Amino acid sequence: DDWEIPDGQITVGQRIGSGSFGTVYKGKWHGDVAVKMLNVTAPTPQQLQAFKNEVGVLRKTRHVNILLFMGYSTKPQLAIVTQWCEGSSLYHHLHIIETKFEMIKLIDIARQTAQGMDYLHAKSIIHRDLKSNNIFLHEDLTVKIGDFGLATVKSRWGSILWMAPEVIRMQDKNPYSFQSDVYAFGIVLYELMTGQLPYSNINNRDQIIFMVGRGYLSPDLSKVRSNCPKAMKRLMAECLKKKRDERPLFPQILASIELLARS
Amino acid sequence: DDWEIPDGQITVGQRIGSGSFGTVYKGKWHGDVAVKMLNVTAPTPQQLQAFKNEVGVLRKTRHVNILLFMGYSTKPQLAIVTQWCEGSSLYHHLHIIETKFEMIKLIDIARQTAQGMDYLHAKSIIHRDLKSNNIFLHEDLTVKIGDFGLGSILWMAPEVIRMQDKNPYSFQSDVYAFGIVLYELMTGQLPYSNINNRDQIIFMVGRGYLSPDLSKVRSNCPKAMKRLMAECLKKKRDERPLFPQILASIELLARSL
Numbered sequence A: 001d002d003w004e005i006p007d008g009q010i011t012v013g014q015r016i017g018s019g020s021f022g023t024v025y026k027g028k029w030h031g032d033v034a035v036k037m038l039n040v041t042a043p044t045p046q047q048l049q050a051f052k053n054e055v056g057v058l059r060k061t062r063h064v065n066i067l068l069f070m071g072y073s074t075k076p077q078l079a080i081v082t083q084w085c086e087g088s089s090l091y092h093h094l095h096i097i098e099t100k101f102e103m104i105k106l107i108d109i110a111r112q113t114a115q116g117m118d119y120l121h122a123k124s125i126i127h128r129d130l131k132s133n134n135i136f137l138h139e140d141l142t143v144k145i146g147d148f149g150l151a152t153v154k155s156r157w158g159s160i161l162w163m164a165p166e167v168i169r170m171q172d173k174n175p176y177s178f179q180s181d182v183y184a185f186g187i188v189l190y191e192l193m194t195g196q197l198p199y200s201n202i203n204n205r206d207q208i209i210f211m212v213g214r215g216y217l218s219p220d221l222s223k224v225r226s227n228c229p230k231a232m233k234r235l236m237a238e239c240l241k242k243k244r245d246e247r248p249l250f251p252q253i254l255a256s257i258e259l260l261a262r263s
Numbered sequence B: 001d002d003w004e005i006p007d008g009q010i011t012v013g014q015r016i017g018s019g020s021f022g023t024v025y026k027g028k029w030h031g032d033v034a035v036k037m038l039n040v041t042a043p044t045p046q047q048l049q050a051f052k053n054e055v056g057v058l059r060k061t062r063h064v065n066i067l068l069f070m071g072y073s074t075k076p077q078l079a080i081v082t083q084w085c086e087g088s089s090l091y092h093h094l095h096i097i098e099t100k101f102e103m104i105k106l107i108d109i110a111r112q113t114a115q116g117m118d119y120l121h122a123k124s125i126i127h128r129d130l131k132s133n134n135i136f137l138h139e140d141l142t143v144k145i146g147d148f149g150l151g152s153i154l155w156m157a158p159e160v161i162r163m164q165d166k167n168p169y170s171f172q173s174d175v176y177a178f179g180i181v182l183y184e185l186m187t188g189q190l191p192y193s194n195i196n197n198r199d200q201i202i203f204m205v206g207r208g209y210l211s212p213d214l215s216k217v218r219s220n221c222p223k224a225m226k227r228l229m230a231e232c233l234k235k236k237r238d239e240r241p242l243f244p245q246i247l248a249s250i251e252l253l254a255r256s257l
């Protein structure tokens, strides 16, 4: 039941940025692969725990819309090897190059993301940092949900715009939940339908945190493109509800999208 | 690690193929999936063993060019769930609806196919039945190797045809199969199309009197490709290259193009 990659086989190449913990490179191992590795002499016991936790999470997943984990190595460095994604993140498409998707596709990118999040939740995985730059649009047609951090381009302002109000406040030692993820998804939906990030009219970062937490500030739903189906706008609204128990789970969401995915 | 899918989650849909050694439908499980089932409710021992063996092989593979295994189920009927491929198989493209790929694309299809076979061999998996129908050209772009059968002589190497030992399948036997696939890609046809008799083909390939007609390769097929093709089809087993070399060749071929 083994996924260790023996030493000397992975050829580390270009250098892409910085992951959850380490540094991500473009590599070669039975084809193009992505290699996250801790560039250190000796791992700390906590660092080695992170590694174990991440390998433990990725090895539970086998789904077209989740980043394909291929193996790991511990022989010179700690290193996770995943598939290599071609193209760019949703964030880059929507907010950097201003890509011009047709609604039929915007809904598809939504549908696929919904599939992957449904899957993760099925296997008791809470993503905790879902956002558009963690959605790679592979080959320009296939969502691949990852946890890149800085492998792909970074968001405007941790990462504030996708945090549900209860996550922002930080009352509990753990405010994260299937529903915290659903709120995140709700903002991704907002991005897709508006083409924009939320709260464009505020330049102060602390003010956004304060207000979204207090439920004084909410995404401006009037900005959704006029050819966006009322089902999708209504669904967006239900994912963005401020009370978390009032948010739908993904089985429901996936249904709702699959429904409107005719006409 | 546990991949058993709880019961009453897979929604079986349209029927895709029957062969008596299983049935395959299209299904819904966290999006689209392929589901291979066993018809008879109370299964046999030989049936149940093949399931454990197939699931055992599949769960060892995580690579972009191999069909993604997603899970298994037993608690109503035995069933294996993989990803659902959109598009058509290589066989179907070449021989049924006769798609004309440009030469850069054909090379690429071959590159990926070898890329996956490299992966399998690395994990000590001999395919034993590589052929154009077992290559799926997913979304007209990514090659997904699989095994959708439920024999096929045209891809069978001499030493396999002759049933030498109880085991004549080797990495080299797959490399031969790969050669026949390269022939299909470059000629656009199946081999020995001028012969209608299966016994004779078996006898003839077996004895080494017959081998594919490399004169039929597209005019703009590179000299390096025609040569690689010849090497992969060498009647003598030990002369055939392994997939690390083949990739090395294919990749160098694409560079000057």
Ligand SMILES: N#CC1(c2cccc(C(=O)Nc3cc(Oc4ccc5nc(NC(=O)C6CC6)sc5n4)ccc3F)c2Cl)CC1
Binding pocket: A016, A019, A020, A024, A034, A035, A036, A054, A057, A058, A059, A061, A066, A067, A080, A081, A082, A083, A084, A085, A086, A087, A088, A120, A125, A127, A145, A146, A147, A148, A151, A152
């Ligand atoms: N399981 C799981 C999740 C999870 C939890 C924790 C960590 C991860 C994770 O992502 N690990 C990971 C990420 C990695 O980052 C990647 C992966 C592919 C990739 N492709 C790129 N392409 C480009 O930049 C364009 C020029 C062509 S950049 C790039 N970076 C690498 C290794 C990992 F383990 C993931 Cl997926 C919830 C999904």
Ligand SMILES: N#CC1(c2cccc(C(=O)Nc3cc(Oc4ccc5nc(NC(=O)C6CC6)sc5n4)ccc3F)c2Cl)CC1
Binding pocket: B016, B024, B034, B035, B036, B054, B057, B058, B061, B066, B067, B080, B081, B082, B083, B084, B085, B086, B087, B088, B125, B127, B145, B146, B147, B148
């Ligand atoms: N790993 C591995 C290997 C291996 C060994 C044994 C069995 C398998 C295997 O394929 N199992 C398997 C296959 C299956 O057949 C499939 C899978 C996907 C699929 N997509 C289709 N698309 C279409 O027909 C057109 C409308 C677009 S049909 C279809 N059928 C199903 C379940 C399996 F376990 C595989 Cl991949 C050695 C290659």
